[PDB]
Design an enzyme around this catalytic site. Structure first.
Site, PDB file in Angstrom:
ATOM      1  N   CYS A   1       0.458   0.631   9.821  1.00 30.26           N
ATOM      2  CA  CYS A   1       0.760  -0.319   8.756  1.00 30.26           C
ATOM      3  C   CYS A   1       2.219  -0.750   8.788  1.00 30.26           C
ATOM      4  O   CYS A   1       3.141   0.077   8.929  1.00 30.26           O
ATOM      5  CB  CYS A   1       0.557   0.296   7.371  1.00 30.26           C
TER       6      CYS A   1
ATOM      7  N   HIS B   1       0.815  -1.213   0.000  1.00 30.13           N
ATOM      8  CA  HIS B   1       0.000   0.000   0.000  1.00 30.13           C
ATOM      9  C   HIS B   1       0.849   1.263   0.000  1.00 30.13           C
ATOM     10  O   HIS B   1       0.327   2.348  -0.248  1.00 30.13           O
ATOM     11  CB  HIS B   1      -0.937  -0.023   1.226  1.00 30.13           C
TER      12      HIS B   1
ATOM     13  N   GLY C   1      -0.993   5.013  10.445  1.00 30.94           N
ATOM     14  CA  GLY C   1       0.451   4.937  10.383  1.00 30.94           C
ATOM     15  C   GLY C   1       1.035   3.682  10.976  1.00 30.94           C
ATOM     16  O   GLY C   1       2.257   3.506  10.936  1.00 30.94           O
TER      17      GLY C   1
END
Ligand SMILES: COc1cccc2[nH]c(C(=O)N[C@@H](CC(C)C)C(=O)NN(Cc3ccc[nH]c3=O)C(=O)C(Cl)Cl)cc12
Ligand SMILES: COc1cccc2[nH]c(C(=O)N[C@@H](CC(C)C)C(=O)NN(Cc3ccc[nH]c3=O)C(=O)C(Cl)Cl)cc12
Lengths: 296, 296
Positions: free
Chosen positions: A140, A41, A138
């Site tokens: 991830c 992503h 944030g």
């Protein structure tokens, strides 16, 4: 004595966490030898990730290990994870493995933001392949792991928060746990069940620690227990589960089917104002291994 | 979203843990610069520790940092802690402070055995100066800490398990928390109370995370709340507590005395089968700071 939700010491994993920035998007990555692993992503409703990756150059990836910048010399995609080849091998790379875990198993999560660790906690993989984490925007790329001796078995990389507030991610080969995808979309998990074998393990932990009020002289059959189990949305108990609880049954002198009669009573009648190991609910995120590790 | 009992990443503390063996007794020590700190019990119903220490030599102390042996070049006693001067400064010494904490404050514990870290979890200092830990024989010398930026504030060194299964220890100057002593004796703690300000902070965490069923339109006075608080063994709530909860009250738009009316209702009526943040009990081991740290 005492029984706590206990994470593994996180130091071996802290030394592997880096920050990966592509364009305006920043998230966390995992630096092992000369490869950084991070959610794909970072290169972005339904992306065509193969197209997006072909349009990238090595120099588009800003990778920072603390202050030190690591230069990307190659990139490739593996399912939902990017592998960024860097010019420097991580000198703090521990012995490690990439292992995919089963529903009902636990692991420690090192919540990480901008490449910097924030906190550590224990999670279980639910039977619907979600985890009940604590993650903000944030997060991830934060990872979950177990440690055996000196070897870190990485089992989870964080990608997604569901509308119900539970979390979804991949193993470290980039394959999602459960029927989820890495897209900006609202996704529902399947129905969940209570992890029966873990509840029994935790009842054994309680006995080891001096909580005995829920014991009774009765024993039940596996099938009579499962009839009651299905009614309260508990996973059916199997003979292999009985076998796995053998060591705890041996240490306490309480046979597994004896403990099952206690659980049946707790399901039908509740606790009547009492608590077990400081909880007013039946706890299902300790495995038999977790109990033996902590009680011995 | 999500709310977990979250410890600080333990890596900075892991690099300071060593093993200290004197005669037949082995426990854990804390290696900072060229000093190892450990419980003075390592030199042993009621010891005369000053006599016992005079009879020791530097070479009686076996200190091991992993495989590497550290040679003791001096020793001194500070209250219930030994300071062993060693020939090597720890190269992994973080920025650190020795801080004594207040009842109601939380910290992370790195459970350690034979100098090797075993697990990490969060504890609160109770108002009776015990902690509800998870410790087995050989855990003496494990430490509790908080981290601010890069600075480790050490607040706890483990010494004792009480007959009730709770734990007692010292600050890092060797002064016990509470009316306990480092002797092989059964010792009772005073009566404990529930940490009211932390329960309110946790109710705010629940609202931030979408649990609102316990809210009501009513507001109460501080004194009417405390009348009910004293009945259920809750710490009296003070204006400074109200002030400390201000940021959480501002974020949620729920005034503190409004939240107090919710807590009063929960104390009088219970939860009626419902849960808050996955708990069927009112949780009191999250400080207002813990909630802001994790929810933001
Ligand atoms: C309409 O879109 C939706 C509706 C309903 C639910 C939804 N969820 C997502 C989602 O999770 N989105 C991913 C990005 C996708 C493209 C992988 C995300 O933001 N991941 N997290 C974790 C994260 C963030 C915030 C809180 N909690 C967390 O764990 C990062 O930090 C980066 C989108 C979405
Ligand atoms: C008649 O004696 C008693 C009656 C009732 C209760 C008692 N408690 C103690 C006690 O705590 N004893 C200290 C040594 C004293 C001399 C400081 C101890 O053994 N400390 N721990 C922690 C520890 C051990 C085991 C489980 N849990 C733990 O936390 C070490 O590892 C080393 C003695 C005692």
């Amino acid at each position: 004595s005492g029984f706590r939700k206990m994470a593994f010491p996180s130091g071996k994993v802290e030394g592997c966490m880096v920050q990966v920035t592509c364009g305006t998007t920043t998230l966390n990555g995992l630096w092992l030898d000369d490869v950084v692993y991070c959610p794909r992503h970072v290169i972005c409703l339904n992306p065509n990730y193969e197209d997006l990756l072909i349009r990238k150059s090595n120099h588009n990836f800003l990778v920072q290990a603390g202050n030190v910048q690591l230069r990307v010399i190659g990139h490739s995609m593996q399912n939902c994870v990017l592998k960024l080849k860097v010019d420097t091998a991580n000198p703090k790379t521990p012995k490690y493995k990439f292992v995919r875990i089963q529903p009902g198993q636990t692991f420690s999560v090192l919540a990480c933001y901008n490449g910097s660790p924030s906190g550590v906690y224990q999670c279980a993989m639910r039977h619907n392949f979600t985890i009940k984490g604590s993650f903000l925007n944030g997060s991830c790329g934060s990872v979950g792991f177990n440690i055996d001796y000196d070897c870190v078995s990485f089992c989870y990389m964080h990608h997604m928060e569901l509308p119900t507030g539970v979390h979804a991610g991949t193993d470290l080969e980039g394959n999602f746990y459960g029927p989820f995808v890495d897209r900006q979309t609202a996704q529902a998990a399947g129905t969940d069940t209570t992890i029966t074998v873990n509840v029994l393990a935790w009842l054994y932990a309680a006995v080891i620690n001096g909580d005995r009020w829920f014991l009774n002289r009765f024993t039940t059959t596996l099938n009579d227990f499962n009839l009651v189990a299905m009614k309260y949305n508990y996973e059916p108990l199997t003979q292999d589960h009985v076998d796995i609880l053998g060591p705890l049954s041996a240490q306490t002198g309480i046979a597994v089917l004896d403990m099952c009669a206690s659980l049946k009573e707790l399901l039908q009648n509740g606790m009547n104002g009492r608590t077990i190991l400081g909880s007013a609910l039946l706890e299902d995120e300790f495995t038999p291994f977790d109990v033996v590790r902590q009680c011995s």
